[PDB]
Write a protein that binds this ligand. Structure first.
Ligand SMILES: [Mg+2]
Ligand SMILES: [Zn+2]
Ligand SMILES: [Zn+2]
Lengths: 145, 357, 55, 193, 80, 364, 56, 59
């Protein structure tokens, strides 16, 4: 961080599950390996991708927390209070201008063509095609009546 | 005529209020209006994108060169500033945020205050005396700011108070206009006093699909001379336009160097028919990035991708374009987009001169 | 400032309000299976106190 | 990990155009739905009073193994539980399509149904060590506010008020007792393990 | 230690009216109380006088932030 | 233990003709709380553990820590320039000076930088002095009786000078008051007769200070010792902890310029953007009621009393908003400052009293 | 002392904000830090001479 | 057992302790409108005592 006015260690909110950390005033240690051997095993052994699956519970550790959970709901929600949950080509493109992936192709879309929220998510999930079918947390038999 | 219907209205003191009248009379012998008043300006724009109108608003807020009063290093005389509570940090922050309407940088002021009485004495801005520069025929600030206060026996001497130039994006003491209104006049609205709609914004179109091209923008300028209101406001608007044009023209001298190896323009041939352009500009903001994206998109409706990013921790704007033409054709289209931006803002400045009398 | 503090070695110190046990009262708690203690004080807040334990 | 970040930006870039907020009016019941909650709570207290009137006539006979005290408290603990229908007046007051407090809870982003009930409808019975408030203020009083051998449910930690309505002094104290237990157990979290 | 030169939130010059607003405010409250001892005027009752029209007469807009910072800022000359 | 106390006068009036519940005394409910807990407004509408959190965090707040600070040489003490009476005050502010500001807080998701107990701050709010003050450290260096003395050491006749340090700043043994001391600078000269060994003092801190006041007083044994007061110009910056009176503490994570912050249709923009997800589990409802009440106080021109255990009605407090020209929920049409696009949702924004907790990132 | 009849006291208009004046009076008489100085005054008036003289 | 000596003093003092729970039930001895209810022991024995000396369960 080349801004001289920042003194904090900054990290993504989805990485806090590894350290059981939050941003209420927690402090964390950081050291940079200077040796070649210590530098190799940092990158090959101790990279945080190795702790994505828990050793304790064999399940995943990371995912969306609090804003990408409620924001992924709103994005893939079928109906908005304004009617159908759609966006034009410009706003569909603008969802991807930050993901740091390769941008999708929107060439087969006029400026007035509307894209569903699921259509935009499918553009991103096509890189790693998976098969999934469960009921969401949204559907609760408590709220159904 | 891209924009019409400017409405200019200064913020005046009401001396029909007896309490305000008496307080002004026996504090500053003030029976008239202050030499510098705030001015509210509301302008209607028609046939223009909100990228352009909001870029103009952002520039007028904190991306236009502005002037403040600063203290030169060592100008705060720790020797004869015997007062203990009026620290240099407190008084410097007080003086930086006094709004000024200055016409040259040469003016230098000084503050020499002595408390030789038995009561705490308040230091106002009428105690700042001009020591260098041509004599002011009109004040550059109001004389009613409470700069500080002195305990009995203490003093405050500050020398070398000069006029510093900057932009409010770097330090807020250079902010110019405060936001007072923004709306789109071509989008219909709900009655949001009803509890059926009180959770929605009020507009009848989602912002994901709406493309408004008729706007009303109201900004308040904090210190403008009373006999020159129209002359000041007009100037401000023109400068805003020009600032944008200048920045746009900088990108304009990058596209033309797409043959030379340049660090701010990177071109790829993704396939045998696709081309990717990446423009990285340091210390740019959402103003230029959004203008560029919007006008590139209007020039090329069937563009494969146009996007931009101003990450806060990187201090740069990165604009990515992916299109189904060659580098020659893509650069031609980019130059056309920039020429359209410059033409839009030249039209805006011409209409500024045509409207404000 | 209300005051109510001490200055020692140039620093400012406060004597803590101490949560002590009431005197002249029998306190019962649980080889030795019960314990009844008593800290008598002969009158006044500064006199010496003699503790007695009935086990 | 690369896809968590990428779907995080789609989610965050959507909300920067859709907006998301929570207000004080997201936590407020309709006057009609406020009466529905008071009816439900009076049913809880009426069923709690029926047990006490059985205690007055000595009609409470425990099973083989339990004493009269522990059978009486088990009857009270279960008679003062919020029915599942308590969410009818909560869900009648809110619009799930716009209410931000509901959407944080319903999507699993933050919060839970008891949190929504406590804020909006009522807190109910305070249980400490799966037990009510035990009289520790001199032999049959839980607080100085309630008489000795008080039979009302309020005397032992039943809070009829929601947070949005404002607790009273006895209800605040009982909730303070409940909260202090959790802090102490969380303090034993570090040391014991 | 004083009412700020500009609003902390938006930057409107609230300080150019601060001094007047102080003195006027004091006089206004003395009109609504009716000549009472400075201690016999309870603090909680002096703050319930509506200053909306006075601030409007100063020429200050109806912004939440500006009026918040103008009304609630503590003066150090009254605490020392 | 011989008393039967009615918890309030409302309870006593309820049982006025009740011969089966005869009270000995009647209580005033606010009496069950301390002075720090009475700072929090509508504290009975918050889950009480957060009231405990505030009682821990209220004393941690910066402000006017004393009215004689220029006459002191303190260690790690913070003086905050600007302080405000809360728009919704309580009885505790009849007896303690408030130390905070009535920040305009927007309760909204804005880019993901306020996630998990972080806030987005206005850089303009920071530049104008919001939660800005000065930080003070002290130094106490003594001498020996005719063995050691103060004075600018000379490298020729003094041994073991500290390596790579700056000795030039000294005048008559001390750096003059008003100059910037750096990392490695020598701040008190000191020579010791045995020829000499250099027991000088160096400034080992990351941020440069300024000599605020230096003095040569006498110790208990009537010996001259060096006393230096070091001051720091502390703005709010990224990593500093804020907190409301309900105990919702958070670290400043991002600072945006004026033109990047969100703004309502009327131009109102926040100083802090706090995540809505900090509310539902913490159940800090008194902060939301405070914003609702304080939003109409500002337009009305009044400061009202929000003491705990007073009768409140959030339905009537929300109608007070609609009578003042706002919406019932206190939410407004708001625009994205970066793009100029309106959110498809009214945003809850209004004045909430916030405090700066004295946990500075530069110290840690 | 024979106090007046309790059935003829007017309190039906006592608001819960009227009851905060009792807390005001209690804090004003008590003082925020009230006992800490009374203890020291008794120590410097009745405490130290008795402990010095009548103890050793 | 209880009611006899484990709580005899408390039971006899109950009609005078002001912190005891009163019950709206008439008295047979002195014809008083209210009685004092005490619930002692783990069997939760209920006793209605009166200032006149009345006591249920033949006391
Ligand atoms: Mg933490
Ligand atoms: Zn403002
Ligand atoms: Zn009887």
């Amino acid at each position: 961080l080349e801004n001289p006015k920042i003194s904090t260690f900054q990290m993504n909110v989805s990485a806090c599950a590894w350290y059981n950390a939050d941003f209420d005033g927690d402090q964390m240690n950081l050291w940079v390996p200077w040796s070649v051997m210590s530098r190799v095993e940092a990158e090959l052994l101790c990279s945080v991708r190795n702790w994505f699956i828990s050793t304790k519970s064999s399940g995943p550790v990371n995912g969306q927390v609090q804003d990408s959970t409620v924001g992924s709901f709103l994005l893939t929600r079928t109906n908005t209070p304004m009617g159908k949950n759609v966006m034009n080509k410009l706003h569909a493109m603008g969802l991807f201008q930050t993901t740091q992936t390769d941008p999708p192709c929107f060439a087969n879309y006029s400026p007035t063509d509307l894209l569903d929220g699921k259509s935009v998510v499918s553009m991103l999930l096509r890189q790693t095609p998976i098969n999934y079918q469960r009921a969401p947390t949204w559907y609760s038999e408590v709220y159904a009546p | 005529k891209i924009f019409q219907n400017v409405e200019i209205k200064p913020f005046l003191i009401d001396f029909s209020n007896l309490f305000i009248k008496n307080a002004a009379k026996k504090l500053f012998q003030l029976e008239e209006q202050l030499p510098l008043v705030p001015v509210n300006v509301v302008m209607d724009f028609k046939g223009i994108s909100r990228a352009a109108v909001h870029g103009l608003s952002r520039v007028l807020q904190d991306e236009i060169p502005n002037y403040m009063l600063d203290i030169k290093p060592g100008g705060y005389k720790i020797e004869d500033s015997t007062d203990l509570f009026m620290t240099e940090q407190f008084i410097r922050n007080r003086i930086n945020f006094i709004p000024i309407y200055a016409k040259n940088e040469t003016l230098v002021f000084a503050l020499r205050s002595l408390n030789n009485s038995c009561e705490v004495k308040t230091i106002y801005s009428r105690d700042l005396i001009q020591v260098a520069g041509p004599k002011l025929k009109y004040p550059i600030f109001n004389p009613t700011f409470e700069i500080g206060f002195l305990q009995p026996g203490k003093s405050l001497i500050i020398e070398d108070i000069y006029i510093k130039k900057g932009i409010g994006r770097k330090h807020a003491a250079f902010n110019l206009a405060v936001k007072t209104h923004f709306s789109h006049l071509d989008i219909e609205q709900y009655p949001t006093d009803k509890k059926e709609y009180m959770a929605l914004s009020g507009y009848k179109q989602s912002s994901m699909t709406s493309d408004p091209r008729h706007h009303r923008l109201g900004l308040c300028f904090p210190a403008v001379p009373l006999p020159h209101i129209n002359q000041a406001v007009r100037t401000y608007l023109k400068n805003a336009c020009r600032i944008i044009i200048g920045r746009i023209q900088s990108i304009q001298k990058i596209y033309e160097n797409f043959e030379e190896p340049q660090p701010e323009l990177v071109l790829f041939s993704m396939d045998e028919e696709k081309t990717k352009a990446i423009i990285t500009i340091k210390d740019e903001t959402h103003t230029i990035g959004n203008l560029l994206k919007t006008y590139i998109y209007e020039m090329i409706p069937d563009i494969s991708f146009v996007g931009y990013q101003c990450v806060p921790h990187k201090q740069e704007m990165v604009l990515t374009i992916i299109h189904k033409a060659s580098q020659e054709d893509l650069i031609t289209l980019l130059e056309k987009s920039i020429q359209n931006i410059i033409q839009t803002f030249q039209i805006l400045e011409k209409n500024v001169d045509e409207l404000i009398a | 400032e209300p005051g109510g503090y001490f200055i020692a070695r140039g620093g400012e110190w406060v004597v803590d309000l101490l949560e002590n046990i009431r005197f002249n009262t029998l306190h019962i708690h649980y080889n030795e299976i019960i314990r009844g203690e008593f800290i008598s004080q002969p009158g006044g807040a500064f006199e010496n106190s003699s503790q007695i334990i009935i086990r | 990990l690369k896809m968590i970040f990428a779907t995080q930006q789609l989610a965050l870039n959507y909300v920067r155009n859709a907006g998301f907020t929570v207000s004080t009016a997201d936590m407020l019941l309709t006057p009609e739905a406020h009466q529905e909650v008071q009816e439900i709570i009076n049913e809880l207290l009426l069923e709690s009073e029926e047990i006490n009137n059985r205690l007055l006539h000595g009609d409470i006979m425990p099973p083989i193994g339990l004493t009269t005290h522990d059978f009486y408290e088990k009857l009270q603990l279960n008679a003062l539980k919020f029915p599942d229908r308590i969410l009818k007046p909560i869900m009648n007051s809110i619009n799930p399509e716009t209410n931000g407090l509901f959407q944080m809870v319903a999507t699993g982003a933050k919060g839970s149904n008891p949190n929504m009930i406590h804020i909006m409808a009522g807190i109910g019975q305070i249980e400490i060590n799966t037990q009510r408030i035990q009289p520790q203020f001199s032999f049959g009083r839980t607080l100085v506010y309630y008489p000795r051998f008080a039979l009302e449910a309020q005397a032992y930690g039943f809070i009829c008020n929601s947070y949005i309505a404002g607790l009273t002094s006895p209800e605040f104290i009982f909730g303070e007792m409940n909260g202090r237990f959790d802090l102490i157990n969380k303090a034993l979290s570090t040391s014991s393990t | 230690m004083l009412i700020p030169v500009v609003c902390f939130t938006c930057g409107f010059p609230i300080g150019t009216y601060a001094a007047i607003f102080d003195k006027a405010r004091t006089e206004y409250i003395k009109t609504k109380m009716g000549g009472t001892l400075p201690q016999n005027i309870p603090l909680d009752a002096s703050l319930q006088i509506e200053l909306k029209d006075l601030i409007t007469a100063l020429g200050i807009p109806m912004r939440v932030c500006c009026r918040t910072h103008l009304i609630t800022t503590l003066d150090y000359r009254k605490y020392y | 233990e011989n008393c039967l106390v009615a918890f309030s006068i409302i309870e006593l009036r309820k049982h006025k003709h009740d011969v089966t519940r005869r009270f000995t005394h009647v209580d005033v409910p606010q009496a069950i709380l301390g002075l720090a807990a009475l700072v929090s407004p509508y504290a009975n509408c918050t889950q009480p553990a957060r009231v405990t959190y505030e009682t821990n965090q209220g004393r941690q707040t910066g402000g006017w820590y004393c009215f004689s600070w220029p006459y002191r040489v303190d260690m790690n003490r913070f003086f905050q320039f600007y302080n405000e009476m809360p728009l919704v005050k309580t009885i505790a502010h009849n007896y303690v000076i408030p130390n905070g500001l009535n920040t305009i807080v927007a309760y909204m998701i804005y880019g993901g930088y306020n996630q998990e107990d972080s806030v987005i701050v206005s850089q303009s709010f920071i530049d104008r002095g919001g939660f800005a003050g000065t930080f003070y450290r002290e130094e106490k260096v003594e001498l020996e009786s005719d063995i050691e003395s103060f004075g600018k050491p000379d490298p020729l006749i003094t041994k073991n000078l500290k390596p790579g340090a700056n000795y030039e700043k000294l005048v008559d043994g001390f750096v003059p008051v008003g100059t910037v001391v750096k990392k490695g600078d020598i701040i008190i000269g000191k020579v010791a007769k045995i020829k000499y060994i250099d027991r000088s003092v160096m400034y080992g801190f990351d941020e440069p200070a300024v000599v605020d006041a230096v003095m040569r007083p006498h110790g208990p044994n009537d010996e001259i010792f060096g006393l230096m007061r070091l001051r720091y110009e502390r703005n709010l910056n990224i990593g500093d902890k804020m907190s409301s009176r309900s105990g919702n503490k958070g670290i400043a994570a991002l600072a945006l310029p004026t033109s990047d912050m969100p703004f309502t249709e009327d131009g109102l923009q926040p100083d802090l953007i706090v995540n809505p997800h900090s509310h539902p589990s913490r159940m800090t409802n008194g902060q939301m009621i405070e914003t609702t009440v304080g939003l109409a106080n500002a337009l009305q021109g009044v400061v009202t009393d929000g003491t705990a255990f007073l009768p409140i009605n959030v339905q009537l407090l929300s109608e007070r908003l609609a009578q003042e020209g706002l919406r019932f929920n206190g939410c407004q049409k708001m625009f994205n400052g970066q793009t100029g696009e309106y959110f498809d949702a009214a945003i809850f924004i209004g004045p909430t009293y916030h405090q700066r907790l004295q946990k500075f990132v530069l110290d840690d | 002392i024979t106090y007046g009849p309790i059935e003829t006291v007017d309190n039906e208009e006592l608001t819960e904000a009227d009851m905060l004046s009792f807390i005001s009076a209690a804090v004003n008489s008590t003082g925020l830090i009230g006992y800490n100085i009374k203890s020291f005054d008794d120590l410097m008036d009745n405490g130290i001479p008795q402990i010095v003289k009548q103890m050793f | 057992g209880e009611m006899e000596d484990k709580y005899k003093i408390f039971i006899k003092n109950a009609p005078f302790d002001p912190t005891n729970c009163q019950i709206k039930k008439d008295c047979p001895n002195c014809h008083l409108d209210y009685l004092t209810q005490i619930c002692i022991g783990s069997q939760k024995i209920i006793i209605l005592v009166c200032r006149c000396g009345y006591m249920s369960n033949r006391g």
